[PDB]
């Protein structure tokens, strides 16, 4: 049970041989990569013969699996850093043979080098595969910075479900429920699901030419060195056969065979259950994928049937079949979201194939119909935010609630936009609704008064003012300790309306733990310090920064319900290193509080009286070894100025996490 | 069995909130004022862990001795130069029980002076001070140990798991002194300690303190620090420590002949102690109650001996030594003064790294001292001059590169030993290592020594051989780069001197002899480890990332400086020409690899169509195309727009390695 500190470690450097990609990509002749991709598609390599002489259907699987592992909970997984290339995901059994898929794209990758990431490439192969099979995508954009290693944070072997039926049972009624929930926790809803599953299986076949548990070598990570990174030494799933009769053209095909004919539960030529027709008019309808003098009968899966059996999915399909323009429209649109969902907002969609239309899931931001504030206005605004009935605590705490939502996995959240004042942020437990309203109130009136007073068209947003009071507040506390710090500040944030906000999607940013505010929700099954570190990672913090941050915060005192937990000082709202001096002091001894979920009491070792209250968040800086080593530097007689500066650089950094 | 690259990752950044120099900050310490504070600490019993004999010294000594005891010659990791006793798993080794308390006790001194003394430097000074305030003078002290901020992820911990040295009860838990005796010698050997130094150290340690085992530790103690509830703030094992009870001497807080008189002059008997452990007790009732109780007036305890003690008495070799000691106090003091000093400084590297007022003027042989350059240094003019001269000679580029790697590759940042400043390459054992191919090397050292002689003979300026090995290679590489149409000028630091045999303890450099060098694609027929893993281990000792390793190996194969000049991994038809040709090739799928039948280390790379062998290789080469992280790195460099990058990266690694020992 030791803190997986390594994940924070990741944020102190970047591994790999690179000292911005956006700039490089901006130089790439996209059209030519799409060209060479077209080519590649019918350009069969002997070491892994192409099905029907078209690689596209495969490449679709390589794109779909690259993005399919996304999760809204943490914005992790997905295809943003091209992490399909690395263990353990690269050896998921659901990703069998997809080593070859990525290998075909190596010449290309090699030709363009730094101008296209594996990341942007894999999704482009997906696009091109499709475009040149009768369809046409709703758009494409690059911008996916290539990662150089696994995601050490993820707590994960399948993209969604078992294709045989849950637990390996051909019970389609039942598999649906598994489909229904994966896709939910994926963000797709009933209609987006069937579009993608059907859009998807209108192409290619399955591969179960013989049983895998006996015909397939180690998966990439256990394979012998000589296999140069490939593995599973034609078989992938264990299930054999195509869906459509035209496995390489966009069309009703799947929705046709699925809905017109009836299907029986059979055992395939690789052991796993599949389905075939009781109907005999599809028998040898499809050309063999390889032998040109050969025919093959279509198959379906439990997973496919479950579309046709679930009350709801079934109707989505009837619609689609009774109307194919809608089939396309939905599937065009779902594909684009499935593949781009985790790249953040418009500012980060690059290239000349980005739609002109902006998607709700980009959590887009309006424009500044005014001239930005200048330094003269800045000091002016900063004086007046301190002159208000608002304390340090209050401003800090607000400035944190506005910025703390930024997560780096999907680039969602942040202070810019000021979505804190909106649903569902203005009404989060941890945000203290009635308290939050006050602060918002008070700052709105500064905007009001600031703007009205201008005879030059300059304006300030609330989103700026939230952060600005925050910086101001933090400067005040540092002046209350004898230091003279000026934080760097960036005007330009804007205020987003509800209309351009998908409120229910923002629920996934709800912190079940918040270290700066010593907030710990009742439920939590993980230990607090675990989720602390995990979040610490969404903000891209190193152990050291997480350490100064929380430590300096406790000197200032900005807690949920204004409690005194970890507030090991008797001069709150003064910025010092008292947290560490007192946490490190052996004069004081710690013990759990009885009849209390999160609380501990710090007693005088002698007297045996109460001296401090705290929680695991505060105490962890004193228990785990590495964190302590950091605490000990900060506690030291001369660490104080250093902790202030370190606090400042930290806070100021988080303030700006989403200034993409 | 996934290659553990995590060890190389640590070499990219440094964790901790310390901006990237400790030395200029140590030169700011008032060593005498800290020693004052430590003095007083010796006798200020805190209630959470009240001093034995009302003097902490002994706890402190065993804390410093454990900080330093974990030191390995084989690879130079462990030791007390990072202070790493402070982090898991080490601080939770059962052998380190209650040293949580000892360390904790130094916290306020640490906090008082802060950045001006590492935990590492401090834990050793606490031992030097404990020892002096009990009537013994130390040989000297030196600061300069950089504090670390996490464990050494490189070390493989495996005479037992988490025992500094041996089982204090005896081998496999039997009270067999003679058997213990051998296990003392072995472990102590693989520590660079001999019979005298071992005897001295064990005998002057146990001159102080006691072994606490009031009850059985199996279930009277809580979990070790790592498994302890959070409220304990990093203490653990909630008086019992090792489970063995008693002091060794009648004045456990004074330096005297007490251990050796007690051990040598009386008969001891094995028995099971209060804590369930094997200890020995004396037959004669003269020693009964001759010792005050650790915490009392009105009571006396009887001395004990451990089995590991009885061992210096039973083995005839330690016995010879022990007897010498008893008979000459002064002799046994010095051996102990010098064994202690060497023990706690051995891994700080050469003499320039030892800082402070109490560094002895004498330098020991195990410091690997470097003579002084008693002559003027080479200037930009003579550098370039001599460079041409080298390039003039009939030495190939694979000669100048290979030699110069041979010279610098022996540095290991774990204990600061090795490197190419001293041309120890030309001295024993180095010029006789197989991997260096002696006869071949000797040719190269022939030419360079003549250039050396030519230049010196022909204003009091001079050039070390050690400088020329490096200068050679730097121009070697400059050329391989000019062959690919790159003009890159390697920076060169003149200065390195030539160590003699009188500055080199030859048998101790065996510990630097590579098993599986990768720049030269060398791999001994011994290794149990798969070769790539040792590759990574060695890399770590050069302080390389996954990237810098990859940059280096790859640019290397385009130059072909292989042991025995084989072809293995040399994927280019333009040898001695520095290019991304390793990766372009290696990555091409037109080639297909498989093992070379009936060969140990060898692989065939084939045309996938003809079956015609296109190249040969080892796991060294092939790993940069199998492992998922390294393959990602080789893809960048094999990209069509990234030759110039590799070239400079390879240079930049090359230059960093040549200079590693430049302290
Ligand atoms: C519950 C959801 C899904 C399940 C259980 C599922 C299951 C499977 C399985 C087991 C394979 C076999 C791979 C093989 O043996 O060759 C397969 C192939 C395939 N899947 Fe899915 N799939 C799902 C959703 C999707 C989606 C969302 C897409 C993309 C829009 C997609 C596209 C494809 C394609 C094109 C192939 C055939 C690849 C080829 O022709 O070689 N599938 N599917
Ligand atoms: C063969 C190697 C050695 C063994 C097996 C050994 C064994 C032990 C054991 C079992 C303890 C009991 C710890 C406890 O229960 O509190 C102990 C204590 C101690 N050891 Fe060692 N020792 C060895 C060598 C050394 C050396 C080389 C030194 C210093 C040079 C040293 C210094 C000490 C001191 C001072 C104590 C007592 C500390 C105190 O009284 O608080 N030992 N030793």
PDB file of C-alpha atoms and ligand atoms in Angstrom, chain B residues 52 58-59 61-62 65 165-166 168 184 188 201-202 205-206 208-212 241-244 248 306 308 336 340, ligand 2:
ATOM      1  CA  UNK B  52      20.710   3.904  27.046  1.00  0.00           C
ATOM      2  CA  UNK B  58      26.094   3.805  20.483  1.00  0.00           C
ATOM      3  CA  UNK B  59      22.745   4.120  18.727  1.00  0.00           C
ATOM      4  CA  UNK B  61      27.401   4.691  15.767  1.00  0.00           C
ATOM      5  CA  UNK B  62      25.285   1.726  14.581  1.00  0.00           C
ATOM      6  CA  UNK B  65      27.704   2.027  10.298  1.00  0.00           C
ATOM      7  CA  UNK B 165      26.029  -8.228   6.858  1.00  0.00           C
ATOM      8  CA  UNK B 166      25.270 -11.571   8.543  1.00  0.00           C
ATOM      9  CA  UNK B 168      23.841 -12.162  14.243  1.00  0.00           C
ATOM     10  CA  UNK B 184      31.913 -12.790   8.089  1.00  0.00           C
ATOM     11  CA  UNK B 188      33.318  -8.420   4.353  1.00  0.00           C
ATOM     12  CA  UNK B 201      35.500  -2.684  12.824  1.00  0.00           C
ATOM     13  CA  UNK B 202      33.421  -5.444  14.561  1.00  0.00           C
ATOM     14  CA  UNK B 205      31.834  -1.161  17.248  1.00  0.00           C
ATOM     15  CA  UNK B 206      30.662  -3.605  19.888  1.00  0.00           C
ATOM     16  CA  UNK B 208      30.104   0.473  22.670  1.00  0.00           C
ATOM     17  CA  UNK B 209      26.340  -0.019  23.435  1.00  0.00           C
ATOM     18  CA  UNK B 210      24.223  -3.140  23.674  1.00  0.00           C
ATOM     19  CA  UNK B 211      21.747  -5.366  21.940  1.00  0.00           C
ATOM     20  CA  UNK B 212      18.133  -4.821  22.947  1.00  0.00           C
ATOM     21  CA  UNK B 241      15.215  -4.252  18.322  1.00  0.00           C
ATOM     22  CA  UNK B 242      17.119  -7.262  17.253  1.00  0.00           C
ATOM     23  CA  UNK B 243      15.635  -9.686  19.860  1.00  0.00           C
ATOM     24  CA  UNK B 244      18.968 -10.281  21.554  1.00  0.00           C
ATOM     25  CA  UNK B 248      29.229  -6.350  25.532  1.00  0.00           C
ATOM     26  CA  UNK B 306      26.918 -12.744  19.967  1.00  0.00           C
ATOM     27  CA  UNK B 308      29.206 -13.385  15.351  1.00  0.00           C
ATOM     28  CA  UNK B 336      39.688   0.737  13.846  1.00  0.00           C
ATOM     29  CA  UNK B 340      35.818   3.356  10.240  1.00  0.00           C
TER      30      UNK B 340
HETATM   31  C1  LIG C   2      29.564  -8.895  11.538  1.00  0.00           C
HETATM   32  C2  LIG C   2      29.054  -7.667  11.613  1.00  0.00           C
HETATM   33  C3  LIG C   2      28.159  -7.178  12.764  1.00  0.00           C
HETATM   34  C4  LIG C   2      27.077  -7.752  13.307  1.00  0.00           C
HETATM   35  C5  LIG C   2      26.407  -9.107  12.937  1.00  0.00           C
HETATM   36  C6  LIG C   2      26.600  -6.859  14.355  1.00  0.00           C
HETATM   37  C7  LIG C   2      25.505  -7.141  15.108  1.00  0.00           C
HETATM   38  C8  LIG C   2      24.813  -6.339  15.945  1.00  0.00           C
HETATM   39  C9  LIG C   2      23.488  -6.568  16.527  1.00  0.00           C
HETATM   40  C10 LIG C   2      22.600  -7.793  16.306  1.00  0.00           C
HETATM   41  C11 LIG C   2      23.129  -5.537  17.244  1.00  0.00           C
HETATM   42  C12 LIG C   2      21.844  -5.419  18.040  1.00  0.00           C
HETATM   43  C13 LIG C   2      21.004  -4.248  17.608  1.00  0.00           C
HETATM   44  C14 LIG C   2      20.011  -4.100  18.688  1.00  0.00           C
HETATM   45  O1  LIG C   2      19.329  -5.112  19.051  1.00  0.00           O
HETATM   46  O2  LIG C   2      19.871  -2.973  19.194  1.00  0.00           O
HETATM   47  C15 LIG C   2      24.235  -4.624  17.158  1.00  0.00           C
HETATM   48  C16 LIG C   2      24.364  -3.435  17.789  1.00  0.00           C
HETATM   49  C17 LIG C   2      25.413  -2.579  17.603  1.00  0.00           C
HETATM   50  N1  LIG C   2      26.364  -2.669  16.626  1.00  0.00           N
HETATM   51 FE1  LIG C   2      26.867  -4.213  15.495  1.00  0.00          FE
HETATM   52  N2  LIG C   2      27.442  -5.724  14.448  1.00  0.00           N
HETATM   53  C18 LIG C   2      28.382  -5.916  13.454  1.00  0.00           C
HETATM   54  C19 LIG C   2      29.429  -5.058  13.168  1.00  0.00           C
HETATM   55  C20 LIG C   2      29.444  -3.801  13.657  1.00  0.00           C
HETATM   56  C21 LIG C   2      30.298  -2.760  13.226  1.00  0.00           C
HETATM   57  C22 LIG C   2      31.279  -3.013  12.086  1.00  0.00           C
HETATM   58  C23 LIG C   2      30.004  -1.698  13.977  1.00  0.00           C
HETATM   59  C24 LIG C   2      30.644  -0.283  13.894  1.00  0.00           C
HETATM   60  C25 LIG C   2      31.855  -0.233  13.339  1.00  0.00           C
HETATM   61  C26 LIG C   2      28.906  -2.075  14.896  1.00  0.00           C
HETATM   62  C27 LIG C   2      28.309  -1.319  15.843  1.00  0.00           C
HETATM   63  C28 LIG C   2      27.251  -1.555  16.698  1.00  0.00           C
HETATM   64  C29 LIG C   2      26.877  -0.747  17.849  1.00  0.00           C
HETATM   65  C30 LIG C   2      27.497   0.497  18.446  1.00  0.00           C
HETATM   66  C31 LIG C   2      25.674  -1.471  18.450  1.00  0.00           C
HETATM   67  C32 LIG C   2      24.817  -1.102  19.668  1.00  0.00           C
HETATM   68  C33 LIG C   2      24.104   0.200  19.397  1.00  0.00           C
HETATM   69  C34 LIG C   2      23.446   0.512  20.691  1.00  0.00           C
HETATM   70  O3  LIG C   2      23.980   0.025  21.727  1.00  0.00           O
HETATM   71  O4  LIG C   2      22.417   1.219  20.643  1.00  0.00           O
HETATM   72  N3  LIG C   2      28.637  -3.357  14.663  1.00  0.00           N
HETATM   73  N4  LIG C   2      25.210  -5.149  16.372  1.00  0.00           N
END
